[PDB]
Amino acid sequence: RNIVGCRIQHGWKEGNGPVTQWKGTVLDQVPVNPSLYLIKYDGFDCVYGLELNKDERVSALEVLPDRVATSRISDAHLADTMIGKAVEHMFETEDGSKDEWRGMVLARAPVMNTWFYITYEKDPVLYMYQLLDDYKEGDLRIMPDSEREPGEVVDSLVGKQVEYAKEDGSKRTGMVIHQVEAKPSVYFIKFDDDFHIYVYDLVKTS
């Protein structure tokens, strides 16, 4: 069975804790590692990358019968306007204070049509939100921008296995899983040792 675009439920075991039950929506099957799926879990805004059929923490995976909701985008031009832009995204804290996070809107999310992929200068992982709602509520500022793009000059990085050294000097690996269409110098890396999707800029140094 193809599980992309399906709702799923599975068990999860964190450390030596109880098996917990989770529901989510399968957004993507990564072409350069088709064991790797991108999932949005109900109630949480981060995109998770899990090898759902290989990960020893995943059990009792089932496809749910319920269909993913499809709502018409309220302002299609606005959606197109925010893609690739720097933003200031307003959140609020426990004392009601406003807490602005600088970030960048990367793309429309797959499968979940009113959601947008976004990442943050101070939290460089992939999130998704229904940002047209934030925008109409006055909680999203879209900043203006400031062929020779690094991501246009180099040979494709997608599907390359990255290597890096820890402070302790041991080698760890990951994979360049995606190049952002709207921002070709921006890339997604999935590290073999973690389930977040990290966002990197390809920068010319010489």
Binding site: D45, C46, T93, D99
Partner: peptide, 11 residues
């Protein structure tokens, strides 16, 4: 506005 409490699962 939204809260960061829903950003990531607790674990």
């Amino acid at each position: 506005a939204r809260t960061k409490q829903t950003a990531r699962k607790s674990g």
